[PDB]
């Protein structure tokens, strides 16, 4: 994990991308923190086709699954990190919850499938990058 595997696609946080990812680039967006690359093998995940605003995600720092309620995707100002300058991030869904450096890449699921991936966090909020608009993944 750290990645969504759907079809012949690998979806990751843009700043966690590997060299192999960029070599096999299909699509990326700085403003969303998403990168998609191609795979040879068939992936097991399905992207959720819904507007669910609750689900379960895996927290890396805690090593646990947590149920969570999150807001609808929006433009959110995000402070400078060592991965980006201060900027607006789009399609970011926010939740109250525990959040640390290294939690990016945890997958958020509902009963319909994959909803998004931890991208940001801090000030008692976990920020998830929504992937449900990416219908071409399925």
């Amino acid at each position: 994990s750290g990645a969504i595997y759907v079809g012949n696609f690998r979806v990751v946080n843009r700043h966690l991308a590997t060299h192999n990812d960029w070599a096999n680039l299909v699509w990326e967006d700085s403003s969303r923190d998403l990168l998609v690359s191609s795979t040879t093998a068939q992936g097991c995940d399905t992207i959720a086709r819904c507007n669910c605003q609750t689900g379960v995600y895996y927290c890396n720092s805690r090593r646990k699954h947590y149920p969570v309620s999150f807001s609808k995707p929006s433009l959110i100002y995000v402070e400078a990190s060592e991965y980006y300058p201060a900027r607006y991030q789009s399609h970011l869904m926010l939740a109250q919850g525990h959040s640390e450096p290294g939690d990016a890449g945890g997958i958020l699921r509902c009963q319909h499938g994959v909803v998004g991936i931890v991208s940001t966090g801090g000030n008692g909020l976990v920020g998830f990058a929504d992937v449900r608009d990416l219908l071409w993944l399925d």
Binding site: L16, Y84, E100, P101, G102, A104, T120, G121
Partner: peptide, 4 residues
């Protein structure tokens, strides 16, 4: 954002 994250990833640390």
């Amino acid at each position: 954002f994250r990833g640390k």
